[PDB]
Amino acid sequence: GMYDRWFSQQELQVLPFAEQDEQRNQTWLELVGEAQQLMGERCPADEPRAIALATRWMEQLEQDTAGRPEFLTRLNEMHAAEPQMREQTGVTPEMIDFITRAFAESKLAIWARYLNAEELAFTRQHYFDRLMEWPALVADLHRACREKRDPASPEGQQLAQRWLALFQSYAGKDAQTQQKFRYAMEQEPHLMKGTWMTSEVLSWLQQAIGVMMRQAQ
Ligand SMILES: COc1cc2c(cc1OCCCC(=O)Nc1cc(C(=O)Nc3ccc4sc(C(=O)Nc5cn(C)c(C(=O)SC[C@@H](O)[C@H](O)CS)n5)cc4c3)n(C)c1)N=C[C@@H]1CCCN1C2=O
Numbered sequence: 001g002m003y004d005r006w007f008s009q010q011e012l013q014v015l016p017f018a019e020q021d022e023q024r025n026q027t028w029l030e031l032v033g034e035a036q037q038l039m040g041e042r043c044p045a046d047e048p049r050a051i052a053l054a055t056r057w058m059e060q061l062e063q064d065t066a067g068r069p070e071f072l073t074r075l076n077e078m079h080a081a082e083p084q085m086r087e088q089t090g091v092t093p094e095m096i097d098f099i100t101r102a103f104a105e106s107k108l109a110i111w112a113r114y115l116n117a118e119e120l121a122f123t124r125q126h127y128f129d130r131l132m133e134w135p136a137l138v139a140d141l142h143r144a145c146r147e148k149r150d151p152a153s154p155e156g157q158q159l160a161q162r163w164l165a166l167f168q169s170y171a172g173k174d175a176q177t178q179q180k181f182r183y184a185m186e187q188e189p190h191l192m193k194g195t196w197m198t199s200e201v202l203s204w205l206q207q208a209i210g211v212m213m214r215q216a217q
C-alpha cells in the first residue's frame, strides 16, 4: 500500500486522510475544482478568489493532517514521488505552487496594513528563502509545548533562536520591524490560519522569545 510505505502504523491511526470520510472527499473535490477553474482563467495569485481559496485549502490541510506539520511534508513528498497520489487527489505540482503563491499573497495583504512599503517589499522578496524549514521548527515547537518543557531552558532558547533566524529570513533584522509583525499577529488572528500554529504553541513560543530578548538586553 502507498500509505503503508510512507507512514508508520502508529501515524496511520492518527492521520485523518487514512480514515474513510465522504464529507472530506467532497470538500477536496470542490477545493481542487476551484483551483483548476482559477488556473484555467490564468487568475493571478493576489486575486481575492485565489487568496480566499488558498486560506480555506490550507485550513483543510491543517484539519486533515490533525495539526501535525510533519504530515504536510510527507504529503508534499508523496505527491512529488507517487503517480498514484496525483491520480487519487487531482492535485498537480503546478496547483500546489499556485496555492503556495496565493497563500503568501493572503499574508502579504494583511501585513501591507502594518508594514511600510520598504518592509513589505523585503518580506515579499524573501518570504520563500527558508520557507521549507518551517514545518520541522513548528513540529519541534509542538513537541516542546506537549512535553511542557521550560521556555527559559537551554533547549527552549535553542527553539527561540531557530525561530528568530527563520523569522528574520523574511522580516529582516530591525527590532522595530519585528514589533510590527508582533502587532499584526495580535490584531489579525487570521495570519495564523494554515500555519499549524495553535494558540497554545504560539503562547509557549511568545514566552521563549520573551526570555531571549531580556537575556542580552
Ligand atoms: C518569559 O515570559 C514569560 C515567562 C513566564 C510566564 C509568562 C511569560 O510571558 C512573558 C513574555 C511575553 C513577551 O514579552 N514576549 C515577547 C514576544 C516578542 C516578539 O518579538 N514576538 C513576535 C514577533 C514576531 C512574530 S512572527 C511569529 C511567527 O510565528 N511567525 C511565523 C510563523 N510561521 C509558521 C511563519 C512562516 O512563515 S511558515 C508559513 C507556513 O505556510 C508553513 O507551512 C508552516 S508549517 N512565520 C511570532 C512572532 C512573535 N517580544 C519582543 C517579546 N508565565 C508563566 C510561567 C509560570 C511560572 C512563571 N512563568 C514564566 O516564566
Ligand SMILES: CCOC(=O)c1nc(NC(=O)c2cc3cc(NC(=O)c4cc(NC(=O)CCCOc5cc6c(cc5OC)C(=O)N5CCC[C@H]5C=N6)cn4C)ccc3s2)cn1C
Pocket: 017, 024, 025, 026, 028, 029, 032, 033, 061, 072, 075, 076, 079, 086, 087, 088, 089, 090, 091, 095, 096, 099, 100, 103, 131, 132, 135
Ligand atoms: C512548504 C510547506 O508546504 C506548503 O507550503 C504547501 N504544501 C501544500 N500541499 C498541498 O497543496 C496539498 C494538497 C493535498 C491534497 C490531498 N488530497 C487528498 O488526499 C484527497 C483529494 C480527494 N479528492 C476526491 O476525493 C475527489 C475525486 C478525485 O478528483 C479528481 C481526480 C483527478 C482529476 C481531477 C479531480 O477532481 C477535479 C484530474 O483531472 N486528474 C489530474 C491528473 C489525473 C486526473 C485524475 N484524477 C480525496 N482526498 C482524500 C492530500 C494531500 C495534499 S498536500 C500546499 N502548500 C502551500
